[PDB]
Amino acid sequence: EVKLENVTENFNMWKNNMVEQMHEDIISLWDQSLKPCVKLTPLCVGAGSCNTSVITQACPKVSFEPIPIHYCAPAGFAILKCNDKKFNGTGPCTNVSTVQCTHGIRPVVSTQLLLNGSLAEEEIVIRSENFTNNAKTIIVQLNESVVINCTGAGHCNLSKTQWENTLEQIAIKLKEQFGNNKTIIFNPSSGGDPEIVTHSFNCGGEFFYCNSTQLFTWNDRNITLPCRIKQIINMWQEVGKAMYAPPIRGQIRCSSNITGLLLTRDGGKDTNGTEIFRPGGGDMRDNWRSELYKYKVVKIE
């Protein structure tokens, strides 16, 4: 009389131990592959006062290529994969499967735009821990890559109809989450550290900072953006400033596929039937989430 049944499970891309594990992992990978020449980081005591700590170490820079990594399940546990269409990322999944390792991932540290990630199968999907809460980041997953090619010439090229269509479809999904009679407008970052204010990322081991104003100024040919490579920067693994070694060659190239974005919606009790969105990012954890949102490690029982 016993009946057969598919084992469903509840996922929460926003509370995933795999994300935190990867964050510490990417960090370890870096500290043993791209150390700074000088690292200045805060050093505080309970009282509340702080003195600056300076660390000088060998900072050998070697040409770096993308090493694909994935996460596998240790003896005793299993990794569930949600396979539902346009999965929200939170709640119970129906068509679930099991895998030995996650898909192949090419980690990339960045802000505003997500690079060389996994695309959406169906159409564009936007996900947030809570859309009503404007203080929560919205992770946009594109279903179609937009190539952006850089050059030490100080500017990265990007299609204009490609990226204009991208904003046009993203805006549509935002209306499906906030309202169809609402007006969507994209605005640049409201400010902060340069890394936050610009589309910054690390390519080949260099830190690029590109102006993204032309990318986030829209009302519902090539688009060249001014990029600059810095040697002194604010660290992403922790609060502090660091100075990395100067570029080896000269004219540092970079080819990447924009697969997603990190956006925030301006909070406003302002009843105006219009919602504004700016480029977000900063916590590389959301970056790790956009890739691990459909995974959940569970105990074999």
């Binding site: 400010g191 936050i196 604010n234 609060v239 990012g281 900063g282």
Partner: peptide, 27 residues
């Protein structure tokens, strides 16, 4: 994040300062 100087810088420009990762952003 250095939240104290983050809020001070942003606030000086009429905005709120919050940490975004180990970074500082004005909302």
């Amino acid at each position: 994040x250095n939240l104290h100087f983050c809020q001070l810088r942003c606030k000086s420009l009429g905005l709120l300062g919050k940490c975004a990762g180990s970074f500082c952003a004005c909302x």
